[PDB]
């Protein structure tokens, strides 16, 4: 009875952490895409812009 009560508590917390890590890894990918896009956008706007020498 003690084992079952405790091992179930641990499963809820593991499940929450699994939701949490997977949230970060899917965000990691799309954020890297967003970052690369932003970097590239800035470089092209500066280069094709007539400002500066």
């Amino acid at each position: 009875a003690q084992q079952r009560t405790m091992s179930e508590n641990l499963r809820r917390n593991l499940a929450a952490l699994e939701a949490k890590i997977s949230e970060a890894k899917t965000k990691k990918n799309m954020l890297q895409a967003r970052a690369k896009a932003a970097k590239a956008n800035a470089e092209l706007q500066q280069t094709l812009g007539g400002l500066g020498t």
Binding site: Q3, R4, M6, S7, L10, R11, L14, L17, E18, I21, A24, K25, K28, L31, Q32, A35, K36
Partner: protein, 54 residues
């Protein structure tokens, strides 16, 4: 206290330096690695617990 404040300024400068040295691409990915490396270890503890319950 001027000593501590000097130390604060030095730590702040070093903190800013290592923040500036970050590249989001590498670091964001590295952070995820750490999350997965930590999760594996917790899974192994839960693995043991389930076996003991059985």
């Amino acid at each position: 206290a001027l000593f501590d404040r000097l130390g604060r300024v030095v730590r702040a400068n070093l903190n800013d330096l290592v923040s500036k040295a970050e590249d989001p691409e590498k670091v964001l990915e590295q952070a995820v690695i750490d999350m997965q490396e930590d999760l594996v270890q917790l899974r192994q503890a839960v693995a043991r617990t389930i076996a003991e319950e059985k």
